[PDB]
Amino acid sequence: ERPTFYRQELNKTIWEVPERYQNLSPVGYGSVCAAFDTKTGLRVAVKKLSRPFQSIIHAKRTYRELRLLKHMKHENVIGLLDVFTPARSLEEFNDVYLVTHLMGADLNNIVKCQKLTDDHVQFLIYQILRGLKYIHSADIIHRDLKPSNLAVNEDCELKILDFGRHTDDEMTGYVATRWYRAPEIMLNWMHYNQTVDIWSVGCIMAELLTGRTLFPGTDHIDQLKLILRLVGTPGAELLKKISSESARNYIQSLTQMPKMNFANVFIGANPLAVDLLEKMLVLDSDKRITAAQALAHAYFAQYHDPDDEPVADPYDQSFESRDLLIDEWKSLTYDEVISFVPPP
Ligand SMILES: Cc1onc(-c2ccccc2)c1-c1ccnc(N)n1
């Protein structure tokens, strides 16, 4: 049946949670507390969504996040341990809490201005690609892959968190929020797809290899110039695919540049790593390596197992193109909370 809930003000917010969750301590859309789940013995992160149904946009976002997390069942991706509301009925339903494994440290905490060993890079990138193969098989695009969205424990085990989002202000200037974005998304060149995530993986892998940001642009234009210096300016083939006439006109104003030699950029790196980087960091998204293809690349020889890289169950996201009222999104959300089944 229904657990017993207890009340607690954490900072300046009232949190009402089942008794199983103890020692709630603030750690960070909503707010997150770390807690101890006495039922499972797990250190958990508990997220209370802020005004989940304040608008149609917010209500749809709440449903989106809950649907996403309920679907994700993979070792290298965030899983949903629990979801609850103190509400006893749809009528009084106003708050949503989400529970997952507590992230202790992220990728940034492990890079820390320093190079990693090649075996470490292999293992870390393998896990991102393993997770991505799974995410992409469900036709989901992360859209926001960066080191701070990747949890890594003490045994170097990685999970992809925080699916995509970001406003114009936070994408402005010398900011990590933009350094890992594919150029087609950064400058809205075209209708983008799953390959945007592969670009991000390339930027991440390079940074693990060198210990430095691959494209630390001081703004959109600076970052584009950094990108084109490395990969070369686009050819006619890609230009046609830039459906944004305006973005295409600006690109054409730039002096043509050839692709650089990646072995001269990534001095001393495993030639197999260099090769993979060349296949990920392709300007034309149509021609980038996919996660499934990248898993089979020689660089991951010691970790690759085609029988241990699972795909996702089908994910129905027809709700995305659906127009509903707040109360309707709210009822859908309530249905999903009530139907939740915890993992074993
Ligand atoms: C960041 C972030 O953004 N959303 C969540 C979240 C998602 C679902 C349930 C609980 C927390 C987290 C998160 C996840 C794990 N650990 C920590 N410290 N934070």
CATH of the domain at 216: 1.10.510.10
> Are residue 291 and residue 321 in the same domain, yes or no?
no
Minimal CA–CA distance to 275: which of 193, 180, 205, 181? 205
> Are residue 298 and residue 325 in the same domain, yes or no?
no
Minimal CA–CA distance to 64: which of 313, 312, 320? 320
Task: Find the Cα–Cα–Cα–Cα dihedral 217, 170, 58, 192, rounded to 10°.
Answer: -20
31 is in an annotated binding site: yes
Q: Which residues contact 260 (CB under 8 A, 6 or more apart)?
A: 229, 230, 231, 232
Q: Which atom of ligand 1 lies nearest, measured to the CA of 34?
A: 18
> Are residue 304 and residue 321 in the same domain, yes or no?
no
User: At CA 161, angle to CA 159 and CA 166, rounded to 5?
Assistant: 150
> Are residue 47 and residue 134 in the same domain, yes or no?
no
Minimal CA–CA distance to 2: which of 87, 118, 75, 81? 87
DSSP, res 194: T
User: CA–CA distance from 203 to each of 10, 170, 256, 295 (Å)?
Assistant: 38, 19, 23, 17
Q: Please give the tally of structural domains in the chain.
A: 2
Dist CA 269 CA 247 (whole Å): 35
Q: Which atom of ligand 1 lies nearest, measured to the CA of 98?
A: 9
The resolution of the experimental structure, rounded to one decimal in Å, is 2.0
Helix (H) or strand (E) holding 21: strand 21-26
What technique was this entry resolved by? Answer: X-ray
> Are residue 117 and residue 253 in the same domain, yes or no?
yes
Candidate of 100, 163, 166 to mutate for ligand 1, largest count of ligand atoms within 8 Å of Cβ? 100
> Hey, what are 179's tokens?
């350094």
Ligand 1 centroid, distance to 100 Cα (angstroms): 7
Q: Which atom of ligand 1 lies nearest, measured to the CA of 103?
A: 16
> Are residue 19 and residue 158 in the same domain, yes or no?
no
Q: Which residues contact 27 (CB under 8 A, 6 or more apart)?
A: 33, 34, 45, 102
Number of residues assigned to the chain: 344
Candidate of 24, 32, 340 to mutate for ligand 1, largest count of ligand atoms within 8 Å of Cβ? 32
Dist CA 19 CA 228 (whole Å): 55
> Are residue 59 and residue 122 in the same domain, yes or no?
no
44 is in an annotated binding site: no
> Are residue 154 and residue 120 in the same domain, yes or no?
yes
Candidate of 49, 66, 72, 161 to mutate for ligand 1, largest count of ligand atoms within 8 Å of Cβ? 161
Dist CA 254 CA 236 (whole Å): 14
Identify the domain containing residue 83 by its residue range.
1-104+312-341
Dist CA 217 CA 227 (whole Å): 9
Dist CA 195 CA 285 (whole Å): 6
> Are residue 215 and residue 289 in the same domain, yes or no?
yes
330 is in an annotated binding site: no
Residues involved in catalysis: 162
> Are residue 328 and residue 275 in the same domain, yes or no?
no
Residues near ligand 1 with C-beta < 6 Å? 27-28, 32, 45, 47, 98-100, 102-103, 161-162
> Are residue 144 and residue 231 in the same domain, yes or no?
yes
Helix axes 326-338, 56-71, angle to 10 degrees: 20
* CATH number of the structural domain spanning residue 18: 3.30.200.20
C-beta neighbour count of 279 within 10 angstroms:
17
User: At CA 207, angle to CA 201 and CA 210, rounded to 5?
Assistant: 140
Side by side, the strands of the sheet bearing 82-84 are 21-26, 30-37, 42-49, 97-101, 82-84
> Are residue 157 and residue 176 in the same domain, yes or no?
yes
User: At CA 320, angle to CA 316 and CA 324, rounded to 5?
Assistant: 115
211 is in an annotated binding site: no
Dist CA 128 CA 112 (whole Å): 19
> Hey, what are 139's tokens?
């036709």
